[PDB]
Amino acid sequence: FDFNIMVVGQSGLGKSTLVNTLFKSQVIPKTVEIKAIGHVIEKMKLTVIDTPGDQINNENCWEPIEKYINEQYEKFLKEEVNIARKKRIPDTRVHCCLYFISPTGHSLRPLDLEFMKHLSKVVNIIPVIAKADTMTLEEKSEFKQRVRKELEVNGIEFYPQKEFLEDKTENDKIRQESMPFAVVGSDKEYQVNGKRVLGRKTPWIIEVENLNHCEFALLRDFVIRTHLQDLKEVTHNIHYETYRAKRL
Amino acid sequence: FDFNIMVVGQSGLGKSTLVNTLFKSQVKIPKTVEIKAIGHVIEGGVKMKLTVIDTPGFDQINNENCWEPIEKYINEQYEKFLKEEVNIARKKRIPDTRVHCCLYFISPTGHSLRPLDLEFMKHLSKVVNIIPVIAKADTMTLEEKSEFKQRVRKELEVNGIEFYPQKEFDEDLEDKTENDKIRQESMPFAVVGSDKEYRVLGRKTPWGIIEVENLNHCEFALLRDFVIRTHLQDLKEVTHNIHYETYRAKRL
Ligand SMILES: Nc1nc2c(ncn2[C@@H]2O[C@H](COP(=O)(O)OP(=O)(O)O)[C@@H](O)[C@H]2O)c(=O)[nH]1
Numbered sequence: 081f082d083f084n085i086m087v088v089g090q091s092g093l094g095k096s097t098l099v100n101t102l103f104k105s106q107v108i109p110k111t112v113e114i115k116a117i118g119h120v121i122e123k124m125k126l127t128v129i130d131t132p133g134d135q136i137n138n139e140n141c142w143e144p145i146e147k148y149i150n151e152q153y154e155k156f157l158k159e160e161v162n163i164a165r166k167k168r169i170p171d172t173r174v175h176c177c178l179y180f181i182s183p184t185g186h187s188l189r190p191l192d193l194e195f196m197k198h199l200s201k202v203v204n205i206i207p208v209i210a211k212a213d214t215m216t217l218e219e220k221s222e223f224k225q226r227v228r229k230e231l232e233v234n235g236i237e238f239y240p241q242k243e244f245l246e247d248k249t250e251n252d253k254i255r256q257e258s259m260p261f262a263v264v265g266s267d268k269e270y271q272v273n274g275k276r277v278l279g280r281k282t283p284w285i286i287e288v289e290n291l292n293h294c295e296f297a298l299l300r301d302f303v304i305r306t307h308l309q310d311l312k313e314v315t316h317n318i319h320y321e322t323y324r325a326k327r328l
Numbered sequence: 329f330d331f332n333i334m335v336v337g338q339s340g341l342g343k344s345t346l347v348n349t350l351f352k353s354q355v356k357i358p359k360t361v362e363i364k365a366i367g368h369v370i371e372g373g374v375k376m377k378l379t380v381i382d383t384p385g386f387d388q389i390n391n392e393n394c395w396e397p398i399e400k401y402i403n404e405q406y407e408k409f410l411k412e413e414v415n416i417a418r419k420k421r422i423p424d425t426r427v428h429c430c431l432y433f434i435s436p437t438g439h440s441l442r443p444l445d446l447e448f449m450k451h452l453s454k455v456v457n458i459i460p461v462i463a464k465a466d467t468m469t470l471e472e473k474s475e476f477k478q479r480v481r482k483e484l485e486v487n488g489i490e491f492y493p494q495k496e497f498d499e500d501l502e503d504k505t506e507n508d509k510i511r512q513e514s515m516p517f518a519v520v521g522s523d524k525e526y527r528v529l530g531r532k533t534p535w536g537i538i539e540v541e542n543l544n545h546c547e548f549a550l551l552r553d554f555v556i557r558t559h560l561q562d563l564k565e566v567t568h569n570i571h572y573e574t575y576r577a578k579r580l
């Protein structure tokens with residue numbers, strides 16, 4: 081049982097911080113290279129892939145990531161044939177990928193859109209709003225609506241895709257309102273209300289998991305519990321298949 | 329008595345919301361497409377017409393010479409004043425539309441400044457008075473803010489980016505003492521913009537309301553006083569005597 085998550089997006093959005101907060105939940109310098117850390121603990125081995133980048137010229141800035149993803153597929157295609165005859169086949173393909181969106185309060189940057197368009201064709205992308213704590217209530221509500229609109233209008237198929245029922249009753253909910261998940265990621269534990277909790281120490285404490293504070297708990301449950309398998313299935317049966325099909 | 333402040337930086341940093349904040353203090357916002365200067369004739373004690381110029385984006389796929397459009401505007405005003413410096417109309421007081429002060433917004437990424445940000449700043453400083461500001465100061469923590477301010481100061485110093493108060497211009501040893509504590513100690517101003525008049529201005533935080541003008545909450549008050557009272561004149565003088573003069577010299 082192996083699950084791979086990857087964080088993508090602009091620099092300085094708390095992508096790296098989230099990775100660690102994510103790991104501390106189930107259980108910070110600047111990213112320069114694509115390094116993926118995996119924790120062999122819940123049965124499951126969850127490895128999260130970090131990334132940097134956000135420059136004077138950003139032409140084809142996605143290729144590096146696309147090369148990596150495609151690199152993981154080719155590897156699985158070579159390892160899909162059980163030459164070593166192993167009961168289980170190691171899978172390092174990117175199942176779920178989170179694209180961090182700067183909460184600019186305006187329309188999505190052209191670069192964000194194109195970047196998501198390319199990846200959506202090759203990987204399961206789940207839109208996320210970084211540093212949600214920055215935005216006000218009315219602001220965040222409107223920003224999500226703006227995001228959902230801009231995405232749908234730009235023909236960006238993101239998980240859960242409409243194409244691939246009880247699930248249809250919930251996919252609409254997760255497509256329709258909840259997403260993109262607005263997250264606050266804090267690596268620090270502070271005892272709040274009698275128990276150790278994770279949260280930002282804003283002079284104003286904000287609880288990373290508290291459903292009343294932010295949607296991190298929702299996103300976490302969504303990717304690690306509810307849709308953990310669906311992600312893997314769509315990765316293998318659609319994306320990966322499409323790769324080898326074009327390859328062969 | 330015309331005072332001209334221009335707000336610059338990448339999109340979605342709170343520049344426009346701050347422009348309105350500044351006016352609203354010393355007296356639903358859409359994305360800006362064109363450069364628009366807002367003039368509001370308001371009262372030091374006497375009358376003063378300050379026009380706050382607004383700047384769109386900076387934020388795109390390929391950002392080359394994205395400063396060119398602004399340089400062109402700034403230079404457009406220098407040519408205009410050069411054209412109106414000779415009082416053919418024999419005017420007692422001459423209308424001034426030159427950018428005296430220019431605030432540059434730096435996203436609080438908590439990392440080293442983006443190379444584009446540096447390039448953007450470097451060109452402007454050699455044509456105008458730049459004053460480094462950190463947008464959405466409220467996002468950061470206390471320890472994070474301190475580290476970022478120091479980080480910005482270092483990067484700018486290292487890159488040779490002369491911002492107001494310029495190191496080159498102060499002559500007096502006393503002048504240096506005061507100016508060394510404003511650009512080392514004080515800059516860059518960590519500000520929080522708020523338009524909605526709530527009856528003290530501020531940002532509506534869930535935990536509690538945050539006073540935009542409070543010194544204990546943010547450094548907006550400091551920035552206002554600096555650019556409106558203390559150094560308003562100094563900014564103008566350097567603009568006229570050095571920046572403008574340099575342009576006029578090059579024009580020949
Ligand atoms: N307001 C806010 N700031 C955050 C949050 N998470 C991280 N930050 C800050 O933003 C900076 C981003 O750093 P990092 O975690 O490496 O994000 P990265 O740019 O993807 O590498 C950090 O210095 C954090 O102090 C958040 O949820 N809200």
Ligand SMILES: Nc1nc2c(ncn2[C@@H]2O[C@H](COP(=O)(O)OP(=O)(O)O)[C@@H](O)[C@H]2O)c(=O)[nH]1
Pocket residue numbers: 184185186214215219338339340341342343344345346357358359360463464465466467519520521522531
């Ligand atoms: N956290 C925080 N958010 C702000 C602040 N000022 C503005 N904002 C929000 O960020 C968005 C930026 O919009 P705007 O004022 O037009 O900035 P602009 O993109 O530079 O024009 C607005 O929708 C505001 O709700 C601030 O001081 N702190």
Ligand SMILES: [Mg+2]
Pocket residue numbers: 095096109110111130131132
């Ligand atoms: Mg990073």
Ligand SMILES: [Mg+2]
Pocket residue numbers: 343344358359360383384
């Ligand atoms: Mg604007």
